[PDB]
Design a binder for these strands. Sequence first.
RNA 1: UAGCUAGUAGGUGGGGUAACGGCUCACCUAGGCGACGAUCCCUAGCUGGUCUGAGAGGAUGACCAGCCACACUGGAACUGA
RNA 2: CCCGCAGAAGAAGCACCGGCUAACUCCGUGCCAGCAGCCGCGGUAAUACGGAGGGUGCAAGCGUUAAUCGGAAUUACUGGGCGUAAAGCGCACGCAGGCGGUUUGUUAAGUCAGAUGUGAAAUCCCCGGGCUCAACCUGGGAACUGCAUCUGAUACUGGCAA
Lengths: 205, 129, 81, 80, 156, 123
Amino acid sequence: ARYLGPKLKLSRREGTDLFLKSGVRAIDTKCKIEQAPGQHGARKPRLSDYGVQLREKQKVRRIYGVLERQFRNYYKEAARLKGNTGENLLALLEGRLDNVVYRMGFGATRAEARQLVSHKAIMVNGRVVNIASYQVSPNDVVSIREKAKKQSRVKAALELAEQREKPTWLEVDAGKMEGTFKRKPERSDLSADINEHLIVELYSK
Amino acid sequence: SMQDPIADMLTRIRNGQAANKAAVTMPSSKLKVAIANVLKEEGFIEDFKVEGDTKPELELTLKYFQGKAVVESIQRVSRPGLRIYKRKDELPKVMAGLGIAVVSTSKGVMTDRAARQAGLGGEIICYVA
Amino acid sequence: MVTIRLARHGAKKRPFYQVVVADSRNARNGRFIERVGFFNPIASEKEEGTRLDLDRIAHWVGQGATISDRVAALIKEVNKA
Amino acid sequence: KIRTLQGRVVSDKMEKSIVVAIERFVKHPIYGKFIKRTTKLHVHDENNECGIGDVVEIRECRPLSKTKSWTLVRVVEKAV
Amino acid sequence: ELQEKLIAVNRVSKTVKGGRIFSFTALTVVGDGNGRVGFGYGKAREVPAAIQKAMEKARRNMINVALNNGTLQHPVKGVHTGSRVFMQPASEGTGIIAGGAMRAVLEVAGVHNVLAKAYGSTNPINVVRATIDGLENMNSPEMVAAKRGKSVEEIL
Amino acid sequence: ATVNQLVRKPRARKVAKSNVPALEACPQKRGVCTRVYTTTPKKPNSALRKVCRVRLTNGFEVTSYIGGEGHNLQEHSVILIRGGRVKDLPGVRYHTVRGALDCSGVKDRKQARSKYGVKRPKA
RNA sequence: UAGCUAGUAGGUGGGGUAACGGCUCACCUAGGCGACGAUCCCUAGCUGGUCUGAGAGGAUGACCAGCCACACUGGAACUGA
RNA sequence: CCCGCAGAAGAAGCACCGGCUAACUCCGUGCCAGCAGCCGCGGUAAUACGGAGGGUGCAAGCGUUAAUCGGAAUUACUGGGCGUAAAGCGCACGCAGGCGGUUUGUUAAGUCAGAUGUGAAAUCCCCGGGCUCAACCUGGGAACUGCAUCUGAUACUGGCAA
Ligand SMILES: [Mg+2]
Ligand SMILES: [Mg+2]
Ligand SMILES: [Mg+2]
Ligand SMILES: [Mg+2]
Ligand SMILES: [Mg+2]
Ligand SMILES: [Mg+2]
Ligand SMILES: [Mg+2]
Ligand SMILES: [Mg+2]
Ligand SMILES: [Mg+2]
Ligand SMILES: [Mg+2]
Ligand SMILES: [Mg+2]
Ligand SMILES: [Mg+2]
Ligand SMILES: [Mg+2]
Ligand SMILES: [Mg+2]
Ligand SMILES: [Mg+2]
Ligand SMILES: [Mg+2]
Ligand SMILES: [Mg+2]
Ligand SMILES: [Mg+2]
Ligand SMILES: [Mg+2]
Ligand SMILES: [Mg+2]
Ligand SMILES: [Mg+2]
Ligand SMILES: [Mg+2]
Ligand SMILES: [Mg+2]
Ligand SMILES: [Mg+2]
Ligand SMILES: [Mg+2]
Ligand SMILES: [Mg+2]
Ligand SMILES: [Mg+2]
Ligand SMILES: [Mg+2]
C-alpha cells in the first residue's frame, strides 16, 4: 500500500527533513519541525537503543515510501548478497525506479514519480514500466513518454532538480526528457545522515 | 594409572609455565620427542634434550617473554576416551592462525598449516596458543 | 513400452516441457529414467527452446525406445539447422 | 579380490553349520566415539572343518536355508 | 573526543534503627573509538553524584587492546565470577551483534563488526569486567611473533 | 557427562506438558454451558468474576472465564472456548469467544472491539 | 516387559514355486534368538524433503516426486506375461 | 496485451500506548464494574478499568487462540554440574565392558590421500535468462557431510611376534 496521511508530521517525528515535499518553500515556513506532533510535543523524546533503531529504520521507510513487508525482503536480499549488508540495502533502495526518477528530476516528489510510473508515463529501454519498485540495472535508459512529455509538473520537477544537487552516478538530458543510469550508486555518493548499521542490528534482534 | 603420557607432558609444561620454572623433566618417548621438535620449530620452547640409554629422561627449556609465559593455552584435543580424526578439508585453525594444532599425519607429526599444504589429514593431538 | 515423451512443468498458462525417457505405464510428470532436453513453446527470440541430446536419444532408439509425434517433430526441427 | 569378512566362531553344535561373531569399529554419529557393534551370522560348514573360538573367513552366497546366507572359504588361527 | 555511556543504574537499600537508607549505584563506560576503553562503578546518595564518580573512576584505570582494522584479531572468551562471554570477529557490514553491556562497551571500544554471546548470569557489573578481560587477554600477530621469535609473514 | 555413560544411557529431552489439554490441540472448541456463576478470586485481588462450566464435544467438563462488562450467557447455551488462563482464578484456564454462535458481544464498547465480537458502529 | 521359541535352528531325502529357501512333507541331531535389549505393550505409513535453529541439533513428513499397504468387514481362488 | 471515453470518482482498516516494547492527556467509576502474557493496576485526581482527543506499529489486512523451534548453556557431543542450592552408591572384591607404560619388525582393520560407481528428479545455494518488476518458471554448476570397491601412505590406536 501507500501512506496517504500528512508528511510534515512524519518529518517532525523523525526530527529532520525527509524531502517528501517539492522544496519551493522551507520546512519551518510550512510547519514546526522542531516540535513533535500531538499535544505532548515541544519536548525532545527520550528514547532507548531500540527506539533509535526503530526511528532510523522508519526514516528510510518513510523517505523511500516502502513498507515493512517490502523492506524486510530488501534487507534479506542485501544480507544474501556479498559485501556490506548496509551499503547493499541502500544501493538496492536507490535502484528503485521511482527513486531514480526523483534523482534525475522527472518528478518533484517520490510520490509524484510513483504516480507517473503507475499512470504509465515512463518507459525503460523503450518498454513501459508499471511498477514503482522496478530494479534499475546499469546502462539502462529511462525516458518520458510522448503522451505525457508536455506536463507542467514534469517540467517544474526539472526546474527544481536543477536547483537541487545533481547525482554523480546518473546522467540526464532535460531537452529530450531522458536519463541514463550509468553505475550502481556507492555509499559516498549518498547522504551521511543515515546510519545504516542501526537497521542490520534491529533486524538481527 | 598413567594412560596419557602426552597429556602428562602437556600438563607438566603448563605447570612449569605457571610456576615460572626454567626447565621441565619427564620420561622420554618417541612421540614426545616429535612433539617437542614441533614446539621448538614453532618457538614455544627454547630447546629439548634426552639423557640416558635405558630410562631416557626428556628435558625441556621453557621460554618467558617480558616476564610472563609464552604458552597461554594448551589442550589435549584427542584423548584415549575420545579419539579425534579429521580430514584436510576440515582441519581446525587455533586463534584464527595465531595458534598451532599439532597433527599426526601419514608422514609424521606436523602443524595444521604444514599438513594442509601437504594435503593430508590425520589425528589432532593437541592445541597450543 | 519404454518411450520418449514430454513431461510438463511450470506455471499455469506458461508450460515448459522436458523430453524424458520413461515407461509408458508411468505417469507424465511422475517417474522417468533420463532427462534429455527441454522445450519452451512460448520462448521468445535469442533464447533456446530446444536442447535435445541426439546421441542419447539414439542410444535408446537403438534399444527399443519409441518416439512420440511431438518428440519426432522437435527432432526434425533441431535437425533442420 | 572377492568381498569377504573375517570373524570368530561361537557355536558348532548345529550340524554342518557354524556361527560367526563379526566384529567391527564403528564411530558414534552423535558423540563421535568409536564402539564395537558386533554382528552374528549363520555360515555353512561343509565337512565341519571349524571349531569354537576359531577365526574364519566367509563369503556371501545363495541362501542355503532360512537363516543361512554365507559360506566359509578357509580357516585361520585354529586356536584351542 | 571521548564518548561516555551509561549502562545500568540500580537502587540499593540499607537498614538502620530509623528504617531503610536508599543509595544509588551507577555503571559507566568510556571509550574513544580506539583501543582505549575503561569502566567505572560509583555509589552515591544522588544519581548525578554516582554517575560523576563513575565517570571519574572510568577516565582513570583505562586499558589498551588491539584491533586489526575495526574488529577483533581472533575469537576470544572471557570469564568472571558468574558471567561467561564469547566474542568473535566478523566481516564489515554485519555490525555489532551483542546484548546489554557488551554492545555498549564494544561500541565505545570502537569494535564495529563482532558476534558475541553471553552464557550464565547477565549481571552488568560482571559482564563488563568479563568483556574487558576478554579484550585484554587477546593477542595480536606482532605481539605473538615477538614472543615466538618468528615473523608476522611466517605466522600468518 | 561421561561419553560411555551417554552412549549406554542416552541424553533424554525433558517432556513438555501442555497446559491446555481439554482442547486436544484445537484452538477453538464448542461446548454447552452447564452452570454460570460468580467466583471470588484469591489475594490480593477482590472482585466477582463471571465463570461458566462447560461440557465439550470430546467429553471434557471444564471451566471458562467470561470477559467483558455484561453477558447474556445462561444454562443450556452453547459457547466457543479459545484458550488462555486467568492467574488470579485458581482453577480455571480457558477463555470464551465473544460474538460466538450464541454468545453476544459486549455493549457500548469501541476500543479493542475485535476481541469482543462487536460490529463496527455506523458513521 | 528378563526370559522366548518344537516347524522352532540345522541336516538327509521327496514334493512345490518363474526362481534359492522348512516354502511344505517323512526321518535324524537340541539346537536358535537375547543385556550390542530377544519376547511383550502403546503409538506411528517411509524417504527425497519442510519448519526452526548460524552450527551441531530439535520438531514434523500436508501439497510436488519415489517406495509400501488397502478398497464395506474376514478369509479364498481362477483367467491372465 | 495494446489504443480512445469522461471524471478524483468506486476503494482503509486493525491492534496498542505503566515497564518488558515504539507510542500520553482529559472525563465516568471507586478492591464495585473490571484488564491481564509476567511484574502487577483499581480501596476519589488510575498515563494499567470504560469512553474521548492525540500518538505509535502494521496494512487489505490487523488482532486473538492451538502446535514446533529458538532464546533454554533449562538434557550442555560441540556446550553444564555433584563440600554448603538438587546431585559421590555406607564401604570393599570382582565378571562382561571401557581405557592402558616402553622398543623394534610386520600386517594395514580404524584413521589419511587419490580414483571409480552410486548417492533419482524435484527442493536449498551460486551465476544468468523469461512472464511490464516481484512472487513464479527455467539453463548450467556446486552440494547431497554418506556408502561400496580399487590404488597407496604408516605418524597414532588396535591385531601378531620378539
Ligand atoms: Mg500485500
Ligand atoms: Mg542463571
Ligand atoms: Mg517335521
Ligand atoms: Mg528336489
Ligand atoms: Mg529340499
Ligand atoms: Mg496408522
Ligand atoms: Mg541455539
Ligand atoms: Mg520420523
Ligand atoms: Mg466407507
Ligand atoms: Mg476383501
Ligand atoms: Mg496362470
Ligand atoms: Mg517507552
Ligand atoms: Mg487493553
Ligand atoms: Mg480519574
Ligand atoms: Mg484505556
Ligand atoms: Mg481514539
Ligand atoms: Mg538446547
Ligand atoms: Mg547447572
Ligand atoms: Mg539443605
Ligand atoms: Mg546438598
Ligand atoms: Mg562416600
Ligand atoms: Mg601403547
Ligand atoms: Mg585401512
Ligand atoms: Mg576415502
Ligand atoms: Mg529478469
Ligand atoms: Mg538430488
Ligand atoms: Mg603397534
Ligand atoms: Mg584392548
